[PDB]
Write a protein that holds these residues in place. Structure first.
Motif, short mmCIF file in Angstrom:
data_model
loop_
_atom_site.label_atom_id
_atom_site.label_comp_id
_atom_site.label_asym_id
_atom_site.label_seq_id
_atom_site.Cartn_x
_atom_site.Cartn_y
_atom_site.Cartn_z
N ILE A 108 0.81 -1.21 0.00
CA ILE A 108 0.00 0.00 0.00
C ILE A 108 0.85 1.27 0.00
CG2 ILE A 108 -1.84 -1.25 1.18
CD1 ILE A 108 -1.22 0.33 3.69
N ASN A 109 0.35 2.29 -0.70
CA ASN A 109 1.05 3.56 -0.79
C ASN A 109 0.24 4.68 -0.16
OD1 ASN A 109 1.39 6.26 -2.64
ND2 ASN A 109 3.36 5.24 -2.31
N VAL A 110 0.93 5.61 0.47
CA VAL A 110 0.31 6.80 1.03
C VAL A 110 0.57 7.96 0.07
CG1 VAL A 110 0.03 8.17 3.11
CG2 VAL A 110 0.99 5.86 3.25
N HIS A 111 -0.45 8.35 -0.69
CA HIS A 111 -0.27 9.34 -1.75
C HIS A 111 -0.88 10.70 -1.40
CE1 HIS A 111 0.55 10.76 -5.79
NE2 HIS A 111 -0.71 11.14 -5.91
N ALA A 112 -0.13 11.76 -1.69
CA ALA A 112 -0.47 13.11 -1.24
C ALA A 112 -1.44 13.88 -2.14
CB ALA A 112 0.79 13.93 -1.00
N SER A 113 -2.41 13.18 -2.70
CA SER A 113 -3.51 13.86 -3.40
C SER A 113 -4.79 13.07 -3.18
CB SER A 113 -3.22 13.99 -4.89
OG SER A 113 -3.43 12.76 -5.57
N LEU A 114 -5.91 13.62 -3.64
CA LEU A 114 -7.17 12.90 -3.61
C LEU A 114 -7.42 12.24 -4.96
CD1 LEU A 114 -9.62 15.22 -1.61
CD2 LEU A 114 -8.21 13.31 -0.80
N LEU A 115 -6.87 11.04 -5.12
CA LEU A 115 -6.98 10.29 -6.37
C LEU A 115 -8.44 10.06 -6.75
CD1 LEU A 115 -4.07 7.82 -5.66
CD2 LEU A 115 -4.08 9.77 -7.22
N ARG A 119 -2.34 12.57 -9.94
CA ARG A 119 -1.40 11.46 -9.89
C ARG A 119 -0.01 12.02 -10.18
NH1 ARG A 119 -4.02 6.41 -13.39
NH2 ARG A 119 -5.91 6.12 -12.12
N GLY A 120 1.02 11.28 -9.80
CA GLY A 120 2.37 11.66 -10.17
C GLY A 120 3.19 12.29 -9.06
N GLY A 121 4.24 13.01 -9.46
CA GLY A 121 5.26 13.48 -8.55
C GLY A 121 4.97 14.73 -7.74
N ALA A 122 4.25 15.69 -8.33
CA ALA A 122 4.03 16.97 -7.65
C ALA A 122 2.57 17.32 -7.38
CB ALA A 122 4.70 18.09 -8.45
N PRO A 123 1.86 16.48 -6.60
CA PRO A 123 0.45 16.79 -6.37
C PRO A 123 0.26 17.95 -5.39
CG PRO A 123 1.06 14.90 -5.07
CD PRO A 123 2.28 15.27 -5.87
N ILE A 124 1.19 18.10 -4.45
CA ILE A 124 1.10 19.17 -3.46
C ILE A 124 1.30 20.53 -4.11
CG2 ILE A 124 2.04 20.12 -1.32
CD1 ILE A 124 2.75 17.41 -0.41
N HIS A 125 2.28 20.63 -5.00
CA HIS A 125 2.49 21.85 -5.76
C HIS A 125 1.27 22.15 -6.62
CE1 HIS A 125 6.43 20.30 -4.70
NE2 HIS A 125 6.97 21.48 -4.94
N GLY A 136 -5.69 16.35 -0.02
CA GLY A 136 -5.70 15.33 1.00
C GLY A 136 -4.73 14.19 0.77
N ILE A 137 -4.92 13.12 1.53
CA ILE A 137 -4.08 11.94 1.44
C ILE A 137 -4.90 10.75 0.95
CG2 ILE A 137 -2.94 10.16 2.81
CD1 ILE A 137 -1.07 12.32 2.32
N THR A 138 -4.39 10.07 -0.07
CA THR A 138 -4.99 8.83 -0.54
C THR A 138 -4.09 7.67 -0.16
OG1 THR A 138 -5.94 9.98 -2.46
CG2 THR A 138 -5.90 7.57 -2.52
N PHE A 204 -3.04 14.36 -13.99
CA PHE A 204 -1.65 14.07 -13.65
C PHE A 204 -0.91 15.30 -13.15
CE2 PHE A 204 -2.87 10.93 -16.86
CZ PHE A 204 -2.55 9.75 -16.21
N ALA A 205 -0.35 15.20 -11.95
CA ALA A 205 0.48 16.27 -11.41
C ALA A 205 1.94 16.03 -11.79
CB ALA A 205 0.33 16.31 -9.91
N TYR A 206 2.26 16.28 -13.05
CA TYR A 206 3.60 16.03 -13.57
C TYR A 206 4.65 16.93 -12.93
CZ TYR A 206 1.70 12.92 -17.10
OH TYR A 206 1.08 11.87 -17.74
N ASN A 207 5.86 16.39 -12.80
CA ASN A 207 6.99 17.09 -12.19
C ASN A 207 7.26 18.45 -12.82
OD1 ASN A 207 8.10 14.46 -10.64
ND2 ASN A 207 7.61 13.93 -12.76
N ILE A 208 7.58 19.43 -11.98
CA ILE A 208 7.73 20.81 -12.42
C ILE A 208 8.98 21.06 -13.26
CG2 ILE A 208 7.65 23.23 -11.69
CD1 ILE A 208 5.25 21.70 -10.81
N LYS A 209 8.77 21.37 -14.53
CA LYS A 209 9.85 21.80 -15.40
C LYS A 209 10.12 23.28 -15.14
CE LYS A 209 8.19 18.55 -18.91
NZ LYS A 209 7.62 18.42 -20.28
N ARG A 210 11.33 23.73 -15.46
CA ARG A 210 11.72 25.12 -15.19
C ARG A 210 10.82 26.14 -15.90
NH1 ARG A 210 15.12 29.22 -13.52
NH2 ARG A 210 15.57 27.91 -11.69
N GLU A 211 10.34 25.78 -17.09
CA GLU A 211 9.45 26.65 -17.84
C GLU A 211 8.09 26.83 -17.16
OE1 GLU A 211 11.44 24.36 -19.74
OE2 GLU A 211 12.75 26.10 -20.02
#
Length: 314
Positions: A108-115, A119-125, A136-138, A204-211
């Motif tokens: 089981i995974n503790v994920h930092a969004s409300l799935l 999804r993905g790397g930067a849901p909090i951002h 929330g936490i899923t 999808f909360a994709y990882n933040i690119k510099r742009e």
């Protein structure tokens, strides 16, 4: 719950530490900990035992730190421990099917969004930057596809007006360790009902690119505000002034009386200058970090630069 439950935990940063700690304080038999190899941290970029590694070795729990857990030699180490449950939180490696199918009560995974949202790397951002009502936490099952497993439990956490991403990290982390503690007995006792994610509702909360760090002055002042705080304090939004790329750490939402072109410095105050946006809500930059300079209040910046009104940013 019980010391009869052998548990392996997989996590790397500070986010995962309360999760692991709560597991331990709960009385579960944590037989092993899997964390990423140690990576440089801070201004100085110093190599440091990962936050989970540090917490684990305080208890004398053996720490596995493979380059890639998806490899035979590495995942066999995990298979050897014979855990009845595997919990992960902020573990940035691909967990093989072999490990996934291994434990009795699943992984089981503790994920930092409300799935299925973020999804993905930067849901909090993303949640903050998207001006989310509440995040929330899923807690869901782990499968091959990233963050696509059946949802076990969830909890809601409100995003306050002056939230930074860093402050929501702690809030979501703390609420995650709690939800997990409330989840594990229910899971093992079969009191939990896995909910398949609706692929229609997936974002999808994709990882933040510099742009994506770049401030879009065209947007509403409400959006630029959430853009700045949603990137604080990592990895921090930026713009342009006098030719310099300026990391904008904080900004206040202030009214602009005469609607001008976005990006224009309309007002100068004691603690910062006000910049025009795409609508009626302006943005006063109070805290910033010009390229090559330390992070500072705009108060100190103003004393040394004084960008006159009419000048555009970006």
């Amino acid at each position: 719950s019980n010391a009869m439950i052998k548990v392996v935990f997989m996590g790397t940063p500070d986010f995962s530490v309360p999760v692991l700690r709560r597991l331990i304080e709960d009385g579960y038999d944590v037989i092993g900990v899997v964390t990423q190899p140690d990576r440089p941290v801070g201004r100085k970029k110093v190599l440091t035992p990962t936050p989970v590694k540090v917490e684990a070795e305080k208890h004398g729990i053996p720490v596995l730190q493979p380059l890639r857990i998806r490899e035979k030699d590495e995942y066999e180490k995990v298979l050897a421990l014979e855990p009845d449950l595997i919990v992960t939180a902020a573990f940035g490696q691909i967990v093989p099917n072999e490990i996934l199918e291994a434990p009795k009560y699943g992984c089981i995974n503790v994920h930092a969004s409300l799935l299925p949202e973020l999804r993905g790397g930067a849901p909090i951002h993303y949640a903050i930057m998207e001006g989310k009502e509440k995040t929330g936490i899923t807690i869901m099952y782990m499968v091959e596809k990233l963050d696509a497993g059946d949802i076990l439990t969830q909890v809601e956490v409100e995003i306050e007006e002056r939230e930074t991403t860093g402050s929501l990290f702690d809030k979501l982390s703390e609420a995650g360790a709690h939800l997990l503690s409330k989840t594990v007995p229910l899971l093992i006792q079969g009191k939990l009902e896995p909910i398949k994610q609706n692929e229609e509702e997936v974002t999808f909360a994709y990882n933040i690119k510099r742009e994506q760090e770049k401030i879009d002055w065209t947007k509403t002042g409400e959006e630029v505000y959430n853009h700045i705080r949603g990137l604080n304090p990592w990895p921090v939004a930026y713009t342009t002034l006098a030719g310099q790329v300026v990391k904008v750490w904080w900004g206040e939402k202030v009214p602009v009386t005469k609607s001008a072109e976005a990006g224009t410095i309309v007002a100068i105050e004691e603690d910062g200058f006000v910049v025009a946006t795409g609508n009626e809500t302006g943005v006063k930059i109070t805290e910033l970090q010009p390229s090559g300079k330390k992070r500072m209040s705009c108060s100190q910046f103003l004393r040394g630069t004084k960008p006159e009104i009419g000048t555009k940013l970006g």
